[PDB]
Amino acid sequence: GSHSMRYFDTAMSRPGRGEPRFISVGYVDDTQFVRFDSDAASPREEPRAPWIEQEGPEYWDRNTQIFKTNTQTDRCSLRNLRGYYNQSEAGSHTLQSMYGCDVGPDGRLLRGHNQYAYDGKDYIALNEDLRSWTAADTAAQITQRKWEAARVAEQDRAYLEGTCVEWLRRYLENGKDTLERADPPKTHVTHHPISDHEATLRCWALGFYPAEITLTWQRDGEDQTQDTELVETRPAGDRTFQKWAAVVVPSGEEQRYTCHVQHEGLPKPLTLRWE
Amino acid sequence: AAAKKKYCL
Amino acid sequence: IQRTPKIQVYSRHPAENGKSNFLNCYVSGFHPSDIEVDLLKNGERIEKVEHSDLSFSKDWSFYLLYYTEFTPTEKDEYACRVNHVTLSQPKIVKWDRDM
């Protein structure tokens, strides 16, 4: 189907404990394929998926240099941000970045992304047009003015429409056996009495990839959104994901409940009941 | 190169 | 200004007594990123615990998976202990094989 490539960068200051740590992780869909950490003994762009390992020394050396420079760039950013908000030198602060591209089944660009958050709050983002910025506050307007003056958006646009898309297409080809394989959820329904008159039904989805899934309970065909406990989708550690949804039902009424599962690895969506 | 050059905020 | 972690403790594969598996503690939805996570066996900190590389969701909240090999048995209890700036004291979540 469609695919995404994203880098997720975190820079965090730590006054009195050295310079800010910079870590960058790269993903294709829900699969991490690279990491860089300024706190590593020898900071280097490192492979984290088997299909990226075939890239030669030039790939690793060039990306390493870009990330070493990005470490310094993010430290400059943190200094500037502290000033934009009139903040003390005493506190720790966090700058996060997300950038990359989405492509369709045919490998054509759907859209690009390049956005930033400071201390967990959206700060500035490149608009979908890849030409203009949206600034969250008067501090981010300073960044916007600087980036407009330096025509930064033009550089980001060229990267996102060219380099990003071209490398994503290559990764998808090289990792086709996994990146383009949807593994369906293995499902079952459990039943546990909680008292004489109530029981919980829990619907399980295990071993699926990618993480996107829909898991719902219905009673007599009506969605039970308010009465369903739904845990966050969680990684198993073997590339796959897990999720469950539970409802408390009156004893004897179990067969009025159906669990519905939608996922791209399924031939057809599932309707499950207890037993 | 695959990784993006970043710009100081 | 801050977001407290959600915590899930669970196994990689369905639990079978006497069969080797992985014990997972997934922490998510937290901010800022500093967090301390221990896996416990009968109350004692397990030594070999590894974790995933720091990343975050589109709402900017961080997530980490901590994991270690374990062989569940009937008698042994497992748990995850988490501390974060948003918590007065460490939170303990017990491993329950049907959650």
Author numbering:
A (entry chain A): 1 to 275
B (entry chain C): 1 to 9
C (entry chain B): 1 to 99
Give passages from the manuscript.
Based on AAKKKYCL, we produced the nested set of N-terminally extended 10-, 12-, 14-, and 20-mer peptides (RA)nAAKKKYCL that can be covalently bound to HLA-B*0801E76C. Our structures revealed that the N-terminally extended peptides bind into the MHC I groove by adopting noncanonical conformations with residue extensions protruding out of the A pocket.
The structures show that the 8-amino acid AAKKKYCL core of all peptides, even the very long 20-mer, zigzags in the groove in an almost identical manner to the 10-mer. The electron density for all peptides was well-defined over the AAKKKYCL core and P−1 Ala. It is noteworthy that partial electron density for P−2 Arg was visible at 0.5σ for the 12-, 14-, and 20-mers, which was not the case, however, for the 10-mer. Nonetheless, we have omitted all residues starting at P−2 Arg from our final models. This water molecule makes the conventional H-bonds to Tyr7 and Tyr171. In the 12-, 14-, and 20-mer structures, Arg62 swings out and up from its canonical position, which opens the A pocket. Although the position of Arg62 in the longer peptides is different from that seen in the 10-mer, and small differences are seen between the 12-, 14-, and 20-mers, all orientations generated an open-ended groove.
